[PDB]
Design a protein around this nucleic acid. Structure first.
Lengths: 213, 207
DNA sequence: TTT
């Protein structure tokens, strides 16, 4: 089945509220009330925060609440505290003894002003082309919050195959950076007129383009 | 009550990945017993679960490859994932599933899928207000590699990215430096790549 | 076989 759709990034200052959506289908999220939510801090196992749409396990603070509307579940965190910064996954029963997890949302508890990413797209080096290989390298730097969506295009047309993207990691200056690689053959690289790396960060999109030359 | 995964961290391509979960402080005579995985930097993926009575139910996209078994005399349950490729590289978690939720999770075990022998990286230049430049450190195994710039003298604006494991079973990473564009072709910028597992060092001046 |  298809993973449940979540936003990549949600954010708020300490004391504010955020809501995370989790969109499924009528055969999972909107088919049962067996929706659960999981919190994951770096390097740790997921930890259950909500089950049966709206119930809290013992020990989970009351600032976490769950709800549902049609085929969309929502996790709401009121009065954000610094320790709420983590990844959050919804999960739903999906019929005939199966479960499907959502794609995950990074919750950022804002401690800096937001920073837009600087995007540099490198074409394959002539040295790499001589090695009968081709990698486009899309470098994304100096952004906050640390969550970004990367999409690749070949002559304005989405390219899903041969894409590898790194989870954003903190730079030495406390903003984030991420990287995406599009792996092609030299012939693929030469056959197309243009290639683009499209970076989406907090509503805004930055696009860089490169062509064989 | 506690679950913990045991078994190897490195499996060869096209072989069977085997893990065991040992339950302590509790029996396996109730509930469901589940496996979930998470590729590095990506989302959770349910693999399957087994009911205490033996009934197995797996993710439909992994069905023909997955075996979950109970071992009651050891209070364990196991996972076998056949036909493994680099795409199966993930943190594998066991978890108890009770009353429609996953409540006690193991710490997880990273399983890397590769039949790669030790190999040193190819280093390719990422040639350039400010300008970004870098080095693509490609097709090495195993981790780690360390990258410095100008023998550690240049640290401002430097960022080295986490490694990606490609479909080949070999790792790649990039390291980048943001410098003033007026210094290009006068200042030299050299990435020093150190791959101890293959006894390899590469210096690459990028221009 | 199976909350």
């Amino acid at each position: 089945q298809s993973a449940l759709t979540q936003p990549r990034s949600v954010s708020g200052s300490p004391g504010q509220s955020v809501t995370i959506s989790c969109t499924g289908t009528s055969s999972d999220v909107g088919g049962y009330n067996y929706v659960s939510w999981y919190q994951q801090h770096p390097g740790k196992a997921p930890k259950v925060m909500i089950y049966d749409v709206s119930k809290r396990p013992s020990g989970v603070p009351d600032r976490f609440s769950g709800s549902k509307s049609g085929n969309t579940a929502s996790l709401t965190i009121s009065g954000l505290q610094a320790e709420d910064e983590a990844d959050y996954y919804c999960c739903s029963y999906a019929g005939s003894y199966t479960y499907v997890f959502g794609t995950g949302t990074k919750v950022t508890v804002l401690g800096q002003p937001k920073a837009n990413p600087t995007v540099t797209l490198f074409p394959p080096s002539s040295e790499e082309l001589q090695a009968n290989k081709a990698t486009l390298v899309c470098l994304i730097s100096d952004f906050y919050p640390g969550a970004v969506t990367v999409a690749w295009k070949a002559d304005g047309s989405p390219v899903k195959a041969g894409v590898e993207t790194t989870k954003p990691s903190k730079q030495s200056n406390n903003k984030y950076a991420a990287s995406s690689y599009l792996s092609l053959t030299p012939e693929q690289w030469k056959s197309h007129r243009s290639y683009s790396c499209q970076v989406t960060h907090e509503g805004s999109t930055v696009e860089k383009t490169v062509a064989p030359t | 009550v506690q679950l913990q995964e045991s078994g190897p961290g490195l499996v060869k391509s096209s072989e069977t990945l085997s893990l065991t979960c040992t339950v302590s402080g509790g029996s396996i005579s109730s509930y469901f017993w589940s496996w979930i995985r998470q590729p590095p930097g990506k989302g959770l993926e349910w693999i399957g679960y087994i009911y205490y009575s033996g009934s197995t139910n797996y993710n439909p996209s992994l069905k023909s490859r997955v075996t979950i078994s109970l071992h009651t005399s050891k209070n364990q349950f196991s996972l076998k994932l056949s036909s493994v490729t680099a795409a199966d590289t993930a943190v594998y978690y066991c978890a108890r599933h009770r009353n429609w939720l996953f409540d006690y999770w193991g710490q997880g075990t990273l399983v890397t899928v590769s039949s790669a022998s030790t190999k040193g990286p190819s280093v390719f230049p990422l040639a350039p207000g400010t300008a970004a430049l870098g080095c693509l450190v490609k097709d090495y195994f195993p981790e780690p590699v360390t990258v410095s710039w100008n023998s550690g003298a240049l640290t401002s604006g430097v960022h080295t990215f986490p490694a990606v494991l490609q479909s080949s079973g070999l790792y790649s990473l990039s390291s980048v430096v943001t410098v003033p564009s007026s210094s290009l072709g006068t200042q030299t910028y050299t990435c020093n790549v150190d791959h101890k597992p293959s006894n390899t060092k590469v210096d690459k001046t990028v221009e």
